[PDB]
Structure formats: structure tokens, C-alpha cells
Design a protein around this nucleic acid. Structure first.
Lengths: 735, 516, 249, 99
RNA sequence: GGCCUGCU
RNA sequence: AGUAGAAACAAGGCC
């Protein structure tokens, strides 16, 4: 007899055992080298899906741009980006009519937010493409570098501390004859108008790793800092709009998505009488981002912001204006090998414009030949369409408009449709009195989608009777069925620290028990395995064992020293008291009454040199990138113990010409620590104002010395010493 | 005060070049938008648009789906980092626990338990390497093991000498030296790295038998679980009883032994790579089990020599050479051992009623490699137990929601209900719930062992077709827009991986048995 | 005394003097987050990889003057080589366990008073009474429920001023809290935590967690109470219901 | 989707014989219900309960879509409604009375 | 041969 | 050689 697990589906329905079809117990695919090939392929594919448009050359950037809008209507089922302006404007108008007051309200709240938003909001972001160094750097670092360059060039309106003022300075920089940047190898280099325009309109391309569910790798993009404020405002407007649309599912979580899917299916099927047939289409959109033209987003926003202050319209329109002229950096480059001479070489992507094509294979040779005409200063113009879901929410708005355009008031026919859209994925429930009606409805829905630059993937889509469908790895079969294979990768040690890892593991087990219908015995097994892996990872074994490690000696002496050994934490080699009933309690508090007072005091000592807290945002928040989803943050319950240390940093900056960044880091951190000691609320509430550091610090020294004498340790001798030391630092700052 | 956000200068001209084709200025386009009102424009273009733009639904019937085509070529080879079906165990019957003990002394003590060593000789060559290097490496390992045996206290971790033998076997000083392009441009041979579709290979029957024997019971318990808080709630008692049942079912399973082997090997390899980055290190493959009588026991499959492991990126490769004892003659399925070099190292005598066999005892030696990501994911193989037993517990809970009572005990003891878990030439064979547990555990273990992008792609594109087939079997009038496209998407994932090809064969068999 | 003294020492050196002079208060946050350290994409892989090194964690410089450089057998506990972009020094994990067996001891009696939420959870569970498990299909319907069982009927911003006035009474600014509920909360949490020396930031964070109301969408069947939702994993399942009554009731 | 109709029941002598048959629209079998009780397992397709083993034989013709139960040497204790099933799907049952 | 780094 | 698979590793750089 030959064993075959798949035959299990002959008795258990597919959805009731779908977890077996998710090989999420092995290493996910990773990219190894350059992503330049993928970037070039994506650029060429985006440009050839809109080949029948019209070509122009921008007078500012001098780059060739392709406009397919209002182009010839498609005559085949292949992907097409020839969106029609009038059709999309009409779709938005119908969306407004079905939801009166949506645009005006959303614009009002967006106007409030834009005129009260601060610059620091831009620091709350992941890697961004700093143009000062032409590389990806943390959002805060890139923002600081750009602000420094602007201030050195004379653009100091951002000193007002307002994001709108920062954007005003950004736009004013566009009209400058010559800017100056700094490079280390420090050298001051001058950038002319066109070079700075291209550096501000460019995107950095990388390869996406840890992407499960496809054989081929893809490319993703990261924009600069000049354009992120406009993107933030536009996405704020789009989120405020989608929050008023029940057909959208992008700005919500997973459980809300399931609830809305259940509600829509029940509404569609229940209202349908015996005569009407119902069919569900589990649709995926092929080349979703490559076929969405930024000009059409400009049209949608300018229709949304009608009868609004002109400044609001301008600030919200700046973003799509820059995306329509966006450029993409090709990537890291290409690495060549010569086996005859036994050597390797790494050529940067910027040489692709001039480098001969003898080194490249046929596929890459043709890709380079096709993309060369669009190469301007080492970057390729990508006007026709978006690169990687930067305007997720606006795309969801367009999809929701398409979904609502079939409310049976615009169809003008017996058939009708509804459903749920989340960018690149949708479920469409279509009802009609007969199979011919369903066919006509789906055909018209597809045709209308093709008029908006949205394509339906026929290969990854199928239609059945309502009651069974899929949506973003959520399988609905007369009710959503748990999978538990999507969350399997999150059952190990997170990698934050000991206490954080313990709390995160127990909380993940608890949550997957609540949401993903994890069984009790399975949860106990998960707890046991997690504890085993945790002890084997942090070298913290039970203590009563003879497992020799680098940490087994101190742990054993602590074990033999303690009297009530049941109170020792698993991190210190103690027994595990966790169970299904204790999954919502931190380890420290669960073992508090069992700890010896000496060990308890040594553990939770504020003066410990290991605990370090930076800001209110990073107290008990851990960023865990979930499998098959975007990066997410979790609140984990933990007590600040000596085990809450933060791990070592990379330390490879020491071998790079960018070595002075570490000295600047140290000096900035010293100044920030001094300010915090002067202003204790610096971390919890970020200080605001327009004065400089030393003014506030010296003046508060004055006052605090005064009052702490009026009652406290200070003495006249010390108070006068502080006053004249303040005068000394004053005259020092003078010179 | 009035807020002023004025578009002017260069940024205005950019706005004039981001409009539809027949517009000249942002002012004019905004005026047109403000003056625009719906006047049935979607209908006009829908009528004018060509009718070939359609989404016609193709009915999906029993006769529609065709079997997935498998690639043809040379048979598929073995890719695992250790022997799974052909492993051999040398034991001592010590009372130490899994992590308890010192590796080298345990390995030497286990190896001294076997008598019948012979001078090693080549049996099956690597066919691409230098087998004498493997022979010399084996003899070097034996000599240095004796060298440790002589001295005072067995070191916790040993470093080996960097002889030319292991320099070749571990691929040392073979990475091309990195230079600048401006100095190497006239070299004709200079070109890109080889970037093409992997070699095509056809499925072989050895993976099927390996999976078959990976779901079989054993004479040992390969899982020694940790401690949990004493159960206080009745639901906790039910959970503990269920967990005890599953542990009794799966502990005596080759899948659990493979899990422990992989976890231990990858943990040791990662720790050695992170600690002894420069110098080659010896690590004996150790796994500790418990017999039916209850006596604890250690088992030594072989040795691993880790090489230079200066791993910077998650994809950087650390090369090692693995040696494992076995009794399976490699002269019967040579195509499964394309990358192995197999020597003859001794003879073994296992008590049998046919006098005593006095079988040969060979050494499978090969050069393999891993990476930080692969090591990390192979050291988390214990979540296969989770996956499998979560599936079984979901089955049990779903069935128990029907009858208002816990149904675990009768499922595991009466064994009345059975699920289709394989096909025999007579027909489809059904097994008890425990066999389903073991089968799912083996499937998860093999997913973790033979993981690859092909597996992910095939899994997704075949889950789609499985859902379509399930809809067909449920009488839900399923339909497709382009089924040929889906088939081509599935068939492009099957290239050379034995596991994915076996999964595709299983899918074809399921289609053949289904659709009736 | 000291604070202004390191201020003067910083202003002595030209670079830090320029940083202090030209940098305005508003930019405080930016430069504080100014770092070359990228946020890790795969934390688990490197935590499993770094812990195999010697000196894998980081600690303040003060550790060099509280913990000896080596333990009894000579295993090093800390190193004097500083981190990449900080003055902190890299140290071994043993320096943690050492601190828990011979490090300085204090009076942790006030931690229960600070971490009110967690200890209240423990007290509620310790006095809970379980019941029989009933096996029947549960119709889990998804609903918006409040998870925090100690929220004082305050929002984030609404309680943020209360938290500042409780911890940072001088940086409150214009705001003087009007609602009398906030008055009593300030009085109680002021007199209760009058000399607690854990940290201002952690105290503020835990006060925010305790007082601020927070809500999330979850699949529930029955219950719906704040105390009954924290144990939602233990009382409700796919095909079983476990009757439970927390210690509070 | 699967409908089932049982045939072949009736009044019989003890020690007599009876051939039940169930036509269907998968594993199959036969369960029975005496007037004073719930369901009793008879046969599945092979496996037979203790009370009916050696006396009764289950068989099926997949080309006729029929499962058969050949009952021999009947006892008064076999008197029940005999229900056919598929696997969730249950027939209406055929009365067998032995006396 | 001596020293530096391992997500920069 | 080996790992791996649309491009890479099989240490890097600095003296």
C-alpha cells in the first residue's frame, strides 16, 4: 500500500482540511542577488501594456513618458492600461450619488489633519530612499539629512515644524538653479535643476524576499522623502473615504474582513428569491499595479476635492503629479563571473545605459535593449503606471466604485452584482434570473473593469454557486473555516528579547486559539514546543539538568541558591507553569508570589544596566512581519525585568566610508539624553517649540536650581554656582 | 490667516504634463472636471467596445479536468541533508537525556560498541568528485576520534586539521576573487552568472517508498516533551488526555525521529558556524530515544564536518561533508545517490532466525551545504507536529460538534471510522485516525525537508484546482474563464524536486479517483 | 549640579556645541531617531544566530563597575568594546543571570502597585471557579468588544493629560483637567506612586494602558463582558464551552 | 445529492433468508433500528457487527450503483427497520420482520 | 605572519 | 565539486 495524503480530500471537504495544502513548515523562497532584472522586466511590461498610448518628452526632466489615457479601446482580453477619463469620472460621480456627502466630509477631515499635521509624523516609517546618499536609509535619518540639506541651501520654512511648510519648502526646492549635497569617501557637490528633479522623482527598487505562494520573484519600490508627505495626505483622504464604504476591506483587519464577507454573501443570496440564481466569482487581478495610471488618480482626487479650498486641491494633487513623472532606479546592478580567469565582478546598474551587451544573456540583452530608450541618468521613466501598491487605498476606492456601479440602479437589467474588493483581490456575488443573465452580468462587469485600467486574471479566477469561495487566504464554505497554516511561522521565538519572546509566544498561542480555532491539546503542544525551543535558543535550561552550555553554570548556582525554585523564570532556568488558563498572564506576574524576595529584588531592579527604554511608542510594541501579509505591530504584555535587554547592533558600519554617521549618532544621543534629563517628558510627549536646545536647558537650570533650593538639597553656594555656570555657558554660546 | 499652497514654477509645468492626452493645463482640466456630469458615457463605450472582450464561463464537468503532466528526464535524486530511510543506529543504552551529555564521548562510546571494522574501500563513486578524498577523510575522522579517546578528558567540541582532502571536500578557496570591472573587460569568457530554468528530472519510485516508511511505527519513543502547569480546569484535562493520545500515536514514528535528527543537526551546525567560523569542526550525529522496556538509549548515525562558515547574508552557503552508516546496498537504486560517495566500512551481525545475516555495512559520504535561513527553518521542524495534530484535532472537534460529546477516546481505541490515506493496486485503502496523524506528520516533515520555491508555487496553483474540483463534487456548477492558463501555471512549478513531483502524482491519482 | 556640568562639558567641544545651538526643540524627535541601524526584517533568525556569539547583548557602561569582568571559572561577563552607535558596551548573557544571583537587591513591593493591570489579571484568575465542559456547536459571531477591563472611561488623549499631570506635573502646560473623575484619578495615582522609582516612562505607559479604553473586533459567543473577554481563549472553543466565573464576581 | 432507496424487506420465517438492496443516485453500509431503540451498526463496505456476523453478507455493484445485504438464518431479534446510508446520507429504511 | 567586520 | 535556482554563495575590505 502506498500512502497518499491528498486522497484524504475524498472524505474531508477541501476547505475543512485546507491547512494540509500550505507548506509553511519549510524555508520560504529568497532572492540571492540583484533585482535589476526584475525591475527592468517590470518597467518594460508596464510600458508595453500601454504601447498604443501617445509618447511625449517632459520639458523639465527630459524623460520620455507614455500617456495611454483615452487611448484606443482594447480589442482583446490581454491586460490593458487604456483607462478612459470620462468613464472613471462617471464612476466616481455614481459613487458620490450612491453615498452623498462622502467626498465633502472626507475632504473636511483631511483638511483638518493636513493643516494640523507635524513634520515628525514622517519619521514613523520604514526604509525610505535618501537622495542625499542615493540609498535606502531609515525614515528618520533620510528626513534629517534632507532637512539639513534644505537648511544649508536656504529653505528654512520647515523650521515652522509643520508638514505643510516642509512640503512648501520641497516644492520651492524644485525651482532652484543649484543645490549642494555632501558626500564622504567630506566633499560638497553641486546638483543642477534637472539632476535634482530626477533625484526627487526617483524610486529605489529591491527584490522582495520571504514571499510564499509563487515560483518567481518580484520587485518592489521605495520612494524618497520629498514625495512621502503628499502620499501621506492622499492616503489619509483615501482611508477616510474607504472607512465610509462598506464594500471596501483594505483599511480593516482580518476578522472585520470575514464579517463583511459573510454579511455581503448573506445579503446577496437571502434577498435573491427562488427564481434568481446566484454565483460567486473568486477573482484576482493580473498586473494590478502596472495598469493603474497616476493621471487617473489625479483625476479621481480632483473630482473628489471639487468645491474645496484651492490650496487643499493643490496639496492633494501634487502627489499624483509627481507619480506621473516618477522615475525608478534600475537596482543594485549585475554580477559577472569568468571561470577561465576565475574571477567575479559587480557592475552597477547605472552602467546599463552605455555598457556593451556582450556580457548579457539573450533575455537580459533584449530587456536592456527595450528599456534603454527610457534610461535618463541611470534611472528609467515609469510614467504609465504604479510600481508597487503605493496608492493602495485609491486603488481600493476605484474597485469599490466598480463594485457599486452594479447596484441594479445603473445596470438597467435583471442581473446585478455586489461584493468586496481589497486591492489585487476581490469576491463578486452576481445574481440573475438565469444562467444567461449571470453570463451577461459577469461579461459587463469585466468590460467595465477593462475601461478603468483594471484587468481580471482569468487563470487565477473561477466562478461557482454562492456558498463556497475564497478571499485573501480566507476560505468560506457556508461559514469561514480556520486555516492555522498562515500563522504557523509565528509560533517560534520572535527574536526581540527573552521576556518579550516569552510574552509574544504565549500571546500568539492565545490569539490563534481565539481567532484561528486552535485546539486545546494543540495549544498545549505548541506551548511545550515553544518552551523547548525558547530554552534551547537562550541557553536557559531547567537548571536541574546536566546540559552543559555557555550559561549552565550561573543558572545552576542560581538554582541551588534559591529556596523556592518554582518562582524562577524560564529565562533563569526555572519550571514552566504556563497552561491554557495562564496564556494571558505575563511570566513575571504568574511567578511573583513564588519568587524569593532576594531574587525578586535582583530581577526587577530599576538600576539594572540592561533595561533601556527610548520612547512611548517602543515600550511594548514588537514589529513582526506576518507571513503572507504586510509588516504589522503587536502589543505584548511584559514586565520590565533584567531580561528586557536589547540585542547587539550590526556593527558593520565601521568598515564603510559612512563611518562618521556613528559619531553623529553618539553625539545626538548624548544631547538627547541631556535634554531628557532636563525635560523628563521628552520621550512620552515629543517637545514642541521654536527655541534652541541650550536656551531651554540653561533657563530650566536657572529655575530648577532656584526652586529646589526654595525646598530641597541645593544650597546658596550651589545655587549661585549654578547661576554663574549658566552665565558661563551663555557666554560660551556667544562665542 | 489664510493658508496658501500655490503650485508655481517647475512644479506647475509638471502638472501640465500629467493630464489626459487632449488637455493643455491643469486649470482647464480642473474646470472640465468641475463642469463634468454623468451623461451615460460608460454605456456608449461599452456598446462601441469590441465584443471579443468577454469573460465567457466555460462549464467545469467531470470530463473536463485532465491529469497534470509530469516532466520527463533523468530520474530524480536525493536532496535531504541526511539519510532518512537508510539510516543505521549505534547505541549505548545510557540513562542520559536528549541534551544531557557530551557529544564526542557519546559518539566514541557508541562506535566502540560495534565490532567488525574493515579497511574502507570504494563501492559506489561520487561520479563527479574525487572519491579517494572521501576515503582519506573517513580514515582521518577515525584517527582523530582515537586521538581524542587517548587524551585526558574528551573535549566538548573538536576542531579538525585542514588537509587538502577536506579543503576540496568543503570547497575552500574556490570562490572567484572579487575584482573591478575596469580591470577585467577584455576577457572573452567574462559573462553573467548562469541563470536558466533548472534541469528537468522525472519522478522515481524511491520517494514514494521513503514516504511510505516515514509513516511507519517504530520500537522507540522519539519525543520527550517538556513540562506544563498542572491542569486545573476540566477542559485542561480533556486537552491533556487528547495530547497524551496523540503523543502515544506519533512518538513511535519515523517522522518524529527525522524531526529530532534535523533539529539536532541544524542546531549543532548553526552553533558551530557562529562560534568556529574559520576552522573545520567535527559533530557526531546524535539522537536519544527510549526503548519499550523504558531504558533510555543514544544513537549515533554518523558525523558531520562543518567548514568555513563566514555567513553574512541569509543566503550565503556553509558547506559541510556528511558521513552516515547504513546497510542499504547502493547498487540497487543508483540514480537516487547521484551526489553521494558510498564506501564499504564493515560487517554487521543482527540476530535473525536464518543463522545470522552478517550483512555488509556501508558508509554514505557526501558534500552538502546549507544557509542561515535553512538552518533556522530546519531547527524549527517541531511545528510539523503542530500542523499535523492541529489538523487531526480540528477533525475531532468538527465531528464532536455533531454528537454533543467528546469523541477522542472512541476514535483512538475503537478505530471504526477510517479515512482514505492511500491507494493499493486493489483500490483505495483507509486507515484509522492514528495512521492519518502519522501520514500528515510525515507530509509536514517532508515539506520542511524538501522545501523549495517549486513546492510553494505548486501548492498554491494546485490548491486552486483542488477548490475547483471540490466545488464540482459539491454540485455547485463551477466554472472557469481560462482553465488552460491555470494548468500551465501548475505545470511550470514541476521541474526537478522529488517532493513536488510526488505531490503532483498524488494530485493526479486523486483526480482519477475523484470525478466519479 | 551634575546635569548642567555635563551640559557645559558638551558645549566645550565644538561639534556638540553646534548641534546644541543650531538644533531647535521641534527637531528633538528627528535627531533622536536619527540612526544608521535598520529595523530587522527577520528577528528570529538573528536572535538564534547572535545568541551563539560571545557578548551578544548590550548594557549601559555602568555595568563595568557593578559586575566583575569574569565569573568564578573565568567566563567573561562583559566587554569594554562599545556598541556601534552608542556608548553602551556589549556584554554576555551570563551578566544577566549573575545580576539575578549576586547583583544588588532592592524593595520590589511597589511593582504590584505599578503593574496594576497584570496583577489584577492574576488576582482575578486565582479566585476563579471552573465548571463542566459542554460539547455543542458554538455559533461564533464577530463583534466589537473592549479588551481592557480597567479602562476608566477615558480616551488616549483624554487620559494623556491626566498621565502627564500624575507623572510630569510641570510639563502639563495650559491644560488643567476639568472633569472631576480625572481629579480623583490624579489624586489617587499621585499619592499611590509618590516615590516609586521604576521609571517615569514605564509608569506613564502603564497608566495609559490601565486608564485608556481600547477596543478590538473578535469572534465571540456569549460573554461580551470585559472580564469574560480576557479569558475568551479558555471559555469558548470550536465545539466546547467551559463555564467560568472570574474572581471579581 | 445522494438519494437512497431500500428494497427487499418483509415478513419472514426464523432461519429464513432475505436479500436487502439499496439503490443510490463512496463507502456504504447497513444500520438497523428496532422499534424500542436508536441506531445499530449492521455492516459497512467489509465489517459486520457481532450480533449478525457469519449470518449476513454485504456486497456492492458499483456499475449498478447498488449495495446489497444478504441476510441468512434470521432470528426474531433481527426485526427492525434496515436503513442504508452513504458517507451524511441516509435512506428511509425497509421493514424486516422475523417471526 | 600581526590586527578589523559579520543585516550597512 | 557542492548548495541553489531566472542570481548568487563557495568570506569581505583595509594595509
Amino acid at each position: 500500500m502506498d500512502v497518499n495524503p491528498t486522497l484524504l480530500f475524498l472524505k474531508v471537504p477541501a476547505q475543512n482540511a485546507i491547512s494540509t495544502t500550505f507548506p509553511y513548515t519549510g524555508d520560504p523562497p529568497y532572492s540571492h542577488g540583484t533585482g535589476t532584472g526584475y525591475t527592468m522586466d517590470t518597467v518594460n511590461r508596464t510600458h508595453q501594456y500601454s504601447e498604443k498610448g501617445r509618447w511625449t518628452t517632459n520639458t523639465e526632466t527630459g524623460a520620455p513618458q507614455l500617456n495611454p489615457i483615452d487611448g484606443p479601446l482594447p480589442e482583446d482580453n490581454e491586460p490593458s492600461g487604456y483607462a478612459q477619463t470620462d468613464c472613471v469620472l462617471e464612476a466616481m460621480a455614481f459613487l458620490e450619488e450612491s453615498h452623498p456627502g462622502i467626498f465633502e466630509n472626507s475632504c473636511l477631515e483631511t483638511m483638518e489633519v493636513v493643516q494640523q499635521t507635524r513634520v515628525d509624523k514622517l519619521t514613523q516609517g520604514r526604509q525610505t530612499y535618501d537622495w542625499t546618499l542615493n540609498r535606502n536609509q531609515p525614515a528618520a535619518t533620510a528626513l534629517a539629512n534632507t532637512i539639513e540639506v534644505f537648511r544649508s541651501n536656504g529653505l528654512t520654512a520647515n523650521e515652522s515644524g509643520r508638514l505643510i511648510d516642509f512640503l512648501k519648502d520641497v516644492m520651492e526646492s524644485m525651482d532652484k538653479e543649484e543645490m549642494e549635497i555632501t558626500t564622504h569617501f567630506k566633499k560638497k557637490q553641486r546638483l543642477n535643476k534637472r539632476s535634482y528633479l530626477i533625484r526627487a522623482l526617483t524610486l529605489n527598487t529591491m527584490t522582495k524576499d520571504a514571499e510564499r505562494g509563487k515560483l518567481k520573484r518580484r520587485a518592489i519600490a521605495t520612494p524618497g522623502m520629498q514625495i512621502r508627505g503628499f502620499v501621506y495626505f492622499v492616503e489619509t483622504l483615501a482611508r477616510s473615504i474607504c472607512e465610509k464604504l462598506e464594500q471596501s476591506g483594505l483599511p480593516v483587519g482580518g476578522n472585520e474582513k470575514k464579517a463583511k464577507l459573510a454579511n455581503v454573501v448573506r445579503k446577496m443570496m437571502t434577498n435573491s428569491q427562488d427564481t434568481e440564481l446566484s454565483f460567486t466569482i473568486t477573482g484576482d487581478n493580473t498586473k494590478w499595479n502596472e495598469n493603474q495610471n497616476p493621471r487617473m488618480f489625479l483625476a479621481m482626487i480632483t473630482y473628489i476635492t471639487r468645491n474645496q479650498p484651492e490650496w487643499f486641491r493643490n496639496v492633494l494633487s501634487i502627489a499624483p503629479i509627481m507619480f506621473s513623472n516618477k522615475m525608478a532606479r534600475l537596482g543594485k546592478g549585475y554580477m559577472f563571473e569568468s571561470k577561465s580567469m576565475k574571477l567575479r565582478t559587480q557592475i552597477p546598474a547605472e552602467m546599463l545605459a552605455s555598457i556593451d551587451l556582450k556580457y548579457f544573456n539573450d533575455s537580459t540583452r533584449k530587456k536592456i535593449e527595450k528599456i534603454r530608450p527610457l534610461l535618463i541618468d541611470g534611472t528609467a521613466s515609469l510614467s504609465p503606471g504604479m510600481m508597487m501598491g503605493m496608492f493602495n487605498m485609491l486603488s481600493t476606492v476605484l474597485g469599490v466604485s466598480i463594485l457599486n456601479l452594479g447596484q441594479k440602479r445603473y445596470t438597467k437589467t435583471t442581473y446585478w452584482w455586489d461584493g468586496l474588493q481589497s486591492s489585487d483581490d476581490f469576491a463578486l456575488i452576481v445574481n440573475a434570473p438565469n444562467h444567461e443573465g449571470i453570463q451577461a452580468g459577469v461579461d459587463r462587469f469585466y468590460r467595465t473593469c477593462k475601461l478603468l485600467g483594471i484587468n481580471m486574471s482569468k487563470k487565477k479566477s473561477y466562478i461557482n454557486r454562492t456558498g463556497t469561495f475564497e478571499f485573501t487566504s480566507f476560505f468560506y464554505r457556508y461559514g469561514f473555516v480556520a486555516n492555522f497554516s498562515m500563522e504557523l511561522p509565528s509560533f517560534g521565538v520572535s527574536g526581540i528579547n527573552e521576556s518579550a519572546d516569552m510574552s509574544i509566544g504565549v500571546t500568539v498561542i492565545k490569539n490563534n486559539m481565539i481567532n484561528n480555532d486552535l485546539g486545546p491539546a494543540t495549544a498545549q503542544m505548541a506551548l511545550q514546543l515553544f518552551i523547548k525551543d525558547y530554552r534551547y535558543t537562550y541557553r536557559c535550561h531547567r537548571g536541574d539538568t546536566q546540559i552543559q552550555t555557555r550559561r549552565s553554570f550561573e543558572i545552576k548556582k542560581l538554582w541551588e541558591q534559591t529556596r523556592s525554585k518554582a518562582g524562577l523564570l524560564v529565562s533563569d532556568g526555572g519550571p514552566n507553569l504556563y497552561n491554557i488558563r495562564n496564556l494571558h498572564i505575563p511570566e513575571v506576574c504568574l511567578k511573583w508570589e513564588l519568587m524569593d524576595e532576594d531574587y525578586q529584588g535582583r530581577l526587577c531592579n530599576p538600576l539594572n544596566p540592561f533595561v533601556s527604554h527610548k520612547e512611548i511608542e517602543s515600550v511594548n510594541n514588537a514589529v513582526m512581519m506576518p507571513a503572507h501579509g504586510p509588516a504589522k505591530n503587536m502589543e505584548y504584555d511584559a514586565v520590565a525585568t533584567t531580561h528586557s535587554w536589547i540585542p547587539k547592533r550590526n556593527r558593520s558600519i565601521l568598515n564603510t566610508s559612512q563611518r562618521g554617521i556613528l559619531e553623529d549618532e553618539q553625539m545626538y544621543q548624548k544631547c538627547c539624553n541631556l535634554f531628557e534629563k532636563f525635560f523628563p517628558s521628552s520621550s512620552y510627549r515629543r517637545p514642541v517649540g521654536i527655541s534652541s536646545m541650550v536656551e531651554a536647558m540653561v533657563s530650566r537650570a536657572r529655575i530648577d536650581a532656584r526652586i529646589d533650593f526654595e525646598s530641597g538639597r541645593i544650597k546658596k553656594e550651589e545655587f549661585a554656582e549654578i547661576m554663574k555656570i549658566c552665565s558661563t555657558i551663555e557666554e560660551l554660546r556667544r562665542q | 490667516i489664510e493658508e496658501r499652497f500655490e503650485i508655481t514654477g517647475t512644479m506647475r509645468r509638471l502638472a501640465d504634463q500629467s493630464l489626459p492626452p487632449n488637455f493643455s493645463s491643469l486649470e482647464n482640466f480642473r474646470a472640465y472636471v468641475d463642469g463634468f456630469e454623468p451623461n451615460g458615457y460608460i454605456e456608449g463605450k461599452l456598446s462601441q467596445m469590441s465584443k471579443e472582450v468577454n469573460a465567457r464561463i466555460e462549464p467545469f464537468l467531470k470530463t473536463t479536468p485532465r491529469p497534470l503532466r509530469l516532466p520527463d528526464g533523468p530520474p530524480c535524486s536525493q536532496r535531504s541533508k541526511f539519510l532518512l530511510m537508510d539510516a543505521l543506529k549505534l547505541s549505548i543504552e545510557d540513562p542520559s537525556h536528549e541534551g544531557e551529555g557530551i557529544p564526542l564521548y557519546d559518539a566514541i562510546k557508541c562506535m566502540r560498541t560495534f565490532f567488525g571494522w574493515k579497511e574502507p574501500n570504494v563501492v559506489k563513486p561520487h561520479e563527479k568528485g574525487i572519491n579517494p578524498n572521501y576515503l582519506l577523510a573517513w580514515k582521518q575522522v577515525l584517527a582523530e576520534l582515537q586521538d581524542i579517546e587517548n587524551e585526558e578528558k574528551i573535549p566538548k567540541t573538536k576542531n579538525m586539521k585542514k588537509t587538502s582532502q577536506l579543503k576540496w571536500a568543503l570547497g575552500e578557496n574556490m570562490a572567484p576573487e572579487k575584482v573591478d570591472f575596469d580591470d577585467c573587460k577584455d576577457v572573452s569568457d567574462l559573462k553573467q552568472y548562469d541563470s536558466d530554468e533548472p534541469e528537468l528530472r522525472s519522478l522515481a519510485s524511491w520517494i514514494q517508498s521513503e514516504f511510505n516508511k516515514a509513516c511507519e511505527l517504530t520500537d522507540s519513543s522519539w519525543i520527550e516533551l517538556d513540562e506544563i502547569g498542572e491542569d486545573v480546569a476540566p477542559i485542561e484535562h480533556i486537552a491533556s488526555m487528547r495530547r497524551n493520545y496523540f503523543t502515544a500515536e506519533v512518538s513511535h514514528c519515523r517522522a518524529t525521529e527525522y524531526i529530532m535528527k534535523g533539529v539536532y543537526i541544524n542546531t549543532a551546525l548553526l552553533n558551530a558556524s557562529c562560534a568556529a567560523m574559520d576552522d573545520f569542526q567535527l559533530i557526531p550525529m546524535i539522537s536519544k530515544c527510549r526503548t519499550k522496556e523504558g531504558r533510555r538509549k543514544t544513537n549515533l548515525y554518523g558525523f558531520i564536518i562543518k567548514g568555513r562558515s563566514h555567513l553574512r547574508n541569509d543566503t550565503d552557503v556553509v558547506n559541510f561533508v556528511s558521513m552516515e552508516f547504513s546497510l542499504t546496498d547502493p547498487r540497487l537504486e543508483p540514480h537516487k545517490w547521484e551526489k553521494y560517495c558510498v564506501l564499504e566500512i564493515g560487517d554487521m551481525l543482527l540476530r535473525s532466525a536464518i543463522g545470522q545475516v552478517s550483512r555488509p555495512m556501508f558508509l554514505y559520504v557526501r558534500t552538502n551545504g546549507t544557509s542561515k535561513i535553512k538552518m533556522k527553518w530546519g531547527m524549527e521542524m517541531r511545528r510539523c507536529l503542530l500542523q499535523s495534530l492541529q489538523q487531526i484535532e480540528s477533525m475531532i472537534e468538527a465531528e464532536s460538534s455533531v454528537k454533543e460529546k467528546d469523541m477522542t477516546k472512541e476514535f483512538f481505541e475503537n478505530k471504526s471510522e477510517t479515512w482514505p490515506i492511500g491507494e493499493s493496486p486493489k483500490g483505495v485503502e483507509e486507515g484509522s485516525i492514528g495512521k492519518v496523524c502519522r501520514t500528515l506528520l510525515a507530509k509536514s516533515v517532508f515539506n520542511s525537508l524538501y522545501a523549495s520555491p517549486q513546492l510553494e508555487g505548486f501548492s498554491a496553483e494546485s490548491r486552486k484546482l483542488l477548490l475547483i474540483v471540490q466545488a464540482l463534487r459539491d454540485n455547485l456548477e463551477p466554472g472557469t474563464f481560462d482553465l488552460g492558463g491555470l494548468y500551465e501555471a501548475i505545470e511550470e512549478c514541476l521541474i526537478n524536486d522529488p517532493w513536488v513531483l510526488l505531490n503532483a502524482s498524488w494530485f493526479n491519482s486523486f483526480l482519477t479517483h475523484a470525478l466519479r | 549640579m551634575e546635569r548642567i556640568k555635563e551640559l557645559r562639558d558638551l558645549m566645550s567641544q565644538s561639534r556638540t556645541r553646534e548641534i546644541l545651538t543650531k538644533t531647535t526643540v521641534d527637531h528633538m524627535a528627528i535627531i533622536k531617531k536619527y540612526t544608521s541601524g535598520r529595523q530587522e526584517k527577520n528577528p528570529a533568525l538573528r536572535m538564534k544566530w547572535m545568541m551563539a556569539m560571545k557578548y551578544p547583548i548590550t548594557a549601559d557602561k555602568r555595568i563595568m563597575e557593578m559586575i566583575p569582568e569574569r565569573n568564578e571559572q573565568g567566563q567573561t561577563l562583559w566587554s569594554k568594546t562599545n556598541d556601534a552607535g552608542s556608548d553602551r558596551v556589549m556584554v554576555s548573557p551570563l551578566a544577566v543571570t549573575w545580576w539575578n544571583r549576586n547583583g544588588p537587591t532592592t524593595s520590589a513591593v511597589h511593582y504590584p502597585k505599578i503593574y496594576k493591570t497584570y496583577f489584577e489579571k492574576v488576582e482575578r484568575l486565582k479566585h476563579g471557579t471552573f465548571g463542566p465542559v459542554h460539547f455543542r456547536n458554538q455559533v461564533k459571531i464577530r463583534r466589537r468588544v473592549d479588551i481592557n477591563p480597567g479602562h476608566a472611561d477615558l480616551s488616549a488623549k483624554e487620559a494623556q493629560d491626566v498621565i502627564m499631570e500624575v507623572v510630569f506635573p510641570n510639563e502639563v502646560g495650559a491644560r488643567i483637567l476639568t472633569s472631576e473623575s480625572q481629579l480623583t484619578i490624579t489624586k489617587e495615582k499621585k499619592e499611590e506612586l509618590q516615590d516609586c522609582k521604576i521609571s517615569p516612562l514605564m509608569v506613564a505607559y502603564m497608566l495609559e494602558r490601565e486608564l485608556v479604553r481600547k477596543t478590538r473586533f473578535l469572534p465571540v459567543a456569549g460573554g461580551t463582558s470585559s472580564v469574560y473577554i480576557e479569558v475568551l481563549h479558555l471559555t469558548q472553543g470550536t465545539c466546547w464551552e467551559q463555564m467560568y466565573t472570574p474572581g471579581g464576581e | 445529492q445522494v438519494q437512497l432507496q431500500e428494497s427487499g424487506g418483509g415478513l419472514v420465517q426464523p432461519g429464513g433468508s432475505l436479500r436487502l438492496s439499496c439503490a443510490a443516485s463512496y463507502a456504504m453500509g447497513w444500520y438497523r433500528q428496532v422499534p424500542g431503540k436508536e441506531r445499530e451498526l449492521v455492516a459497512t463496505i467489509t465489517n459486520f457487527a457481532d450480533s449478525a456476523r457469519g449470518r449476513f453478507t454485504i456486497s456492492r455493484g458499483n456499475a449498478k450503483n447498488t449495495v446489497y445485504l444478504q441476510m441468512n438464518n434470521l432470528k426474531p431479534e433481527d426485526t427492525a427497520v434496515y436503513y442504508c446510508w452513504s458517507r451524511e446520507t441516509w435512506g428511509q429504511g425497509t421493514q424486516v420482520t422475523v417471526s
